Amino acid sequence: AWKGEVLANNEAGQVTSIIYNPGDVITIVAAGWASYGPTQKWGPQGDREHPDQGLICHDAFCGALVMKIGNSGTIPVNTGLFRWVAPNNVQGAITLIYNDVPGTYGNNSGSFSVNIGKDQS
Amino acid sequence: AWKGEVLANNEAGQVTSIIYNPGDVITIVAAGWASYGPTQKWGPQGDREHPDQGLICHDAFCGALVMKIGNSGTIPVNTGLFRWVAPNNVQGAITLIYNDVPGTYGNNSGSFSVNIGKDQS
Amino acid sequence: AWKGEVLANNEAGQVTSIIYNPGDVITIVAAGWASYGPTQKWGPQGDREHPDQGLICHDAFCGALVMKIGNSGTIPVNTGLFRWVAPNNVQGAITLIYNDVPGTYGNNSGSFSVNIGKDQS
Amino acid sequence: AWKGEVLANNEAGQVTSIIYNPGDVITIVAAGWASYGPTQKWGPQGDREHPDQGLICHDAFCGALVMKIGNSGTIPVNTGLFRWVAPNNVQGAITLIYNDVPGTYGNNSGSFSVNIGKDQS
Ligand SMILES: [O][C][C]1O[C](/O=C2/[C]=[C]C3=NC4=C([C]=C([O])[C]=[C]4)OC3=[C]2)[C]([O])[C]([O])[C]1[O]
Ligand SMILES: [O][C][C]1O[C](/O=C2/[C]=[C]C3=NC4=C([C]=C([O])[C]=[C]4)OC3=[C]2)[C]([O])[C]([O])[C]1[O]
Ligand SMILES: [O][C][C]1O[C](/O=C2/[C]=[C]C3=NC4=C([C]=C([O])[C]=[C]4)OC3=[C]2)[C]([O])[C]([O])[C]1[O]
Ligand SMILES: [O][C][C]1O[C](/O=C2/[C]=[C]C3=NC4=C([C]=C([O])[C]=[C]4)OC3=[C]2)[C]([O])[C]([O])[C]1[O]
Ligand SMILES: [Ca+2]
Ligand SMILES: [Ca+2]
Ligand SMILES: [Ca+2]
Ligand SMILES: [Ca+2]
């Protein structure tokens, strides 16, 4: 299992020690407060009221927690995933990333605390 | 070995000549272009941007190629499977199917060309 | 057999460990999502709607997976090849390459995951 | 080896396929013309006349080519590195980056063409 922080201003994301392998079932729980700019902060689901101006993940809100597995495209994490299995042909280290528009991470703040573990399978 | 076409609008699926037997190793390669409704077409992985609105296979995108072995649950095929072995207790004729919402196949178009063969074991 | 990934941003492609020899029968299965610039992503068949502006392979769409065998010309791979035998004489290491216009790979993203194996002959 | 281009306007840089490991000896050659905003363009050593207004790399001119390896700090690349060995405890993926002030990449233009290879060691 892995536990750590993902900073909202980290554009390249936080690489974890979890290597997702084919067939793996995983659980993720994410908590905390962060912002893509405003002084207000939001949780791991992001800001449901904010428009998508070119987010790295178009299937989650701005300010949401997302991830990449190996060199996959972004996948929404939000508050977490429960006994979750990746699509076919997706594998590799899990990298956690705050959902924002490329080039605009500089004014972000806060972080999410995240647990990831592999489940019985 | 089997080679044939799977029409996107064929809700029942295309039954192939391949009977999958315990211990069998198979390879599938799929190609072509199809749509679940829009003018655009997609390849065998389907449309990654599209929400799951009640697809026959929740483990693949809308417009992806999937299959049933005998009466198994749906199994993602996508662009294909390389030297793949079925889950415990899965056996019978392989049926190829376009991934869409039941009752909505009528506006589908295009097809995938698919090869299936058995590998050494 | 060989399994690995090829970056859309790499003009040099990915050299594999497969040496294609006269008479060899091979199978390739490719999957994944990549872009040659636009926000959308496409599978290994590429973008069937995009014009050819000087692609390294004129026989496949922009954004498709292609290959070279030794010092051959580019050969389309797309989603894969099923028990495929090459054009006469062709031989040498297989290099996998993303199909784009030379000099323009700078805005490319994503990758394809590929399995290659030799079949019986 | 890796071959490609690095867009001047990409704040996140260009993540190559090269993973730098302890002991590796690498060569990089970079060419081309790019700008941090003005209509003029400069080569990979950037603009020797331009003041540092908060560059991501203080050891290179604005408009220069630099890199990170894994999560290292920025390392000047300029026109390239000849049979180069990294500092102790530096390792990981090579990301190439245009040297500009954070939050100001949006008006940049052009790119550098870059080759990276591992040398014998
Ligand atoms: O998207 C992303 C971005 O965001 C920003 O912030 C902000 C804030 C506020 C706002 N509002 C509005 C808009 C638009 C429209 O249309 C209306 C309204 O937007 C916005 C934004 C930040 O700052 C940045 O950085 C980014 O992240
Ligand atoms: O899913 C399945 C279905 O699909 C359809 O198509 C379509 C088109 C378009 C669209 N759009 C949108 C949606 C959702 C949301 O949320 C938004 C937007 O969806 C859709 C869909 C068809 O028609 C049918 O048939 C089926 O397939
Ligand atoms: O080809 C290749 C290339 O591509 C690009 O992208 C793009 C985008 C958009 C567009 N649009 C149009 C065209 C043409 C015509 O004629 C019209 C319209 O194109 C295009 C393109 C990129 O960016 C690059 O890089 C390359 O890849
Ligand atoms: O650095 C960086 C920046 O840059 C800019 O651009 C520019 C242009 C011009 C100029 N001039 C001058 C200066 C300073 C002093 O002191 C004097 C003069 O600066 C400048 C700048 C841009 O726009 C931005 O974006 C950035 O990149
Ligand atoms: Ca922001
Ligand atoms: Ca439909
Ligand atoms: Ca391109
Ligand atoms: Ca600038």
CATH number of the domain where residue C77 is located: 2.60.120.430
Going by beta carbons, is chain A in contact with chain B, meaning 3 or more pairs sit under 8 Å apart? yes
Buried b (16+ CB within 10 A) or exposed e, B27-66: bbbbbbbbbbbeeebbbbbbbbeeeeeebbbebbbbbbbb
Cβ atoms of residues A2 and A93 within 8 Å: no
Q: Among all residues of chain C, which has the CA nearest to that of D113? A: C103
| Strand partners for C26 | C84, C118
**Residue D52, both tokens:** 């540092």
**Residue C59, both tokens:** 């026989």
Cβ atoms of residues A79 and A45 within 8 Å: yes
Q: Residue B81 and residue D60: Cα distance in Å, rounded?
A: 49
User: Would the CB of B21 count as within 6 Å of ligand 2?
Assistant: no
Look up tokens 């058995």; give the residue: B118
Neighbors of chain D with 3 or more C-beta pairs under 8 Å: A, C
Residue-level length of chain C: 121
Q: Residue D72 and residue D91: Cα distance in Å, rounded?
A: 8
DSSP A95: E
Compare CB distances from B78 to A73, A85, A89 and report the shortest one's residue.
A89
Q: Label residue A12 exposed, middle or buried (CB < 10 Å: 0-12, 13-18, 19+).
A: middle
Q: Residue A83 and residue A100: Cα distance in Å, rounded?
A: 26
Q: Residue A66 and residue A78: Cα distance in Å, rounded?
A: 7
Measured in Å, residue A46 CA sits from the centre of ligand 2 at 25
**Residue B48, both tokens:** 């990654």
**Residue B7, both tokens:** 């029409």
Q: What are the two backbone dihedrals, phi and then psi, of residue A105, each rounded to the nearest 5 degrees?
A: -75, -10
Cβ atoms of residues D110 and D66 within 8 Å: no
Q: Residue B43 and residue B65: Cα distance in Å, rounded?
A: 9
How far lies B4's CA from each of B32, B110, B120, C94, D34, in Å? Answer: 12, 14, 22, 28, 51
Closest CA to B63 of B36, B39, B81, B40: B36
**Residue B40, both tokens:** 């655009």
Q: Does A85 touch chain B (CB under 8 A)?
A: yes
How far lies A9's CA from each of A13, A66, A101, D43, in Å? Answer: 9, 14, 11, 30
Range of the domain at A2: 1-121
Closest CA to B84 of B43, B118, B114, B46: B118
Longest dimension (CA), chain D: 43
| Strand partners for B120 | none
- The conformational region for residue A58 under phi > 0 = left, psi -120 to 50 = alpha, else beta, is alpha
Distance from the D96 Cα atom to the nearest Cα atom in chain A, whole angstroms: 13
Contact flag A58-B76 (C-beta cutoff 8 Å): no
C39 contacts in chain A (CB < 8 Å): 54
Q: What are the two backbone dihedrals, phi and then psi, of residue B80, each rounded to the nearest 5 degrees?
A: 145, 180
How far lies B18's CA from each of B15, C4, C82, C83, C97, in Å? Answer: 8, 29, 16, 17, 33
A88 contacts in chain B (CB < 8 Å): 59-60, 76, 78
Cβ atoms of residues B63 and B47 within 8 Å: yes
Q: Does A88 touch chain B (CB under 8 A)?
A: yes
C108 contacts in chain A (CB < 8 Å): none
CA end-to-end span of chain B: 15
Q: Does D6 touch chain C (CB under 8 A)?
A: yes
**Residue D74, both tokens:** 């920025």
Taking the CB of residue A109, how many other CB atoms lie within 10 A of it?
15
| Strand partners for B81 | B28
Return the amino acid letter for A57.
Answer: C
The helix/strand count (H/E) of chain D reads as 0, 8
Cβ atoms of residues C59 and C86 within 8 Å: no
Q: Residue A88 and residue B78: Cα distance in Å, rounded?
A: 8
Q: Residue C2 and residue B108: Cα distance in Å, rounded?
A: 36
Interface test with C, best of A58, A88, A89 (most C CBs within 10 A): A89
DSSP B106: G
DSSP B40: S
Strand, coil or helix: what is D6? strand
Cβ atoms of residues C65 and C30 within 8 Å: yes
**Residue C106, both tokens:** 């700078």
D74 contacts in chain A (CB < 8 Å): none
Domain tally for chain A? 1
Q: What are the two backbone dihedrals, phi and then psi, of residue D32, each rounded to the nearest 5 degrees?
A: 115, -175
Determination approach: X-ray
Going by beta carbons, is chain B in contact with chain D, meaning 3 or more pairs sit under 8 Å apart? no
**Residue D40, both tokens:** 């003029």
Cβ atoms of residues C1 and C117 within 8 Å: yes
Distance from the C71 Cα atom to the nearest Cα atom in chain D, whole angstroms: 17
Cβ atoms of residues B33 and B42 within 8 Å: yes
Resolution in A: 1.8
Q: Residue A37 and residue D104: Cα distance in Å, rounded?
A: 16
**Residue D99, both tokens:** 């040297």
Q: What are the two backbone dihedrals, phi and then psi, of residue B105, each rounded to the nearest 5 degrees?
A: -75, -15
**Residue D109, both tokens:** 């233009």
Cα C46 vs. chain centroid, distance in angstroms? Answer: 11
Ligand nearest to the Cα of D52, by number: 4
Distance from the B113 Cα atom to the nearest Cα atom in chain C, whole angstroms: 11
**Residue B106, both tokens:** 């009528």
Q: Does A121 touch chain C (CB under 8 A)?
A: no
Contact flag A71-C39 (C-beta cutoff 8 Å): no
Residue A53 Cα: closest atom of ligand 1: 1
Q: How many CA atoms lie within 13 A of B7 on its CB side?
A: 9
- The alpha-carbon radius of gyration of chain C (Å, integer) is 14
Contact flag B82-C30 (C-beta cutoff 8 Å): no
Q: Does A9 touch chain D (CB under 8 A)?
A: no
Residue-level length of chain A: 121
Q: Among all residues of chain A, which has the CA nearest to that of D92? A: A15
A103 contacts in chain D (CB < 8 Å): 10-12, 103, 105-106
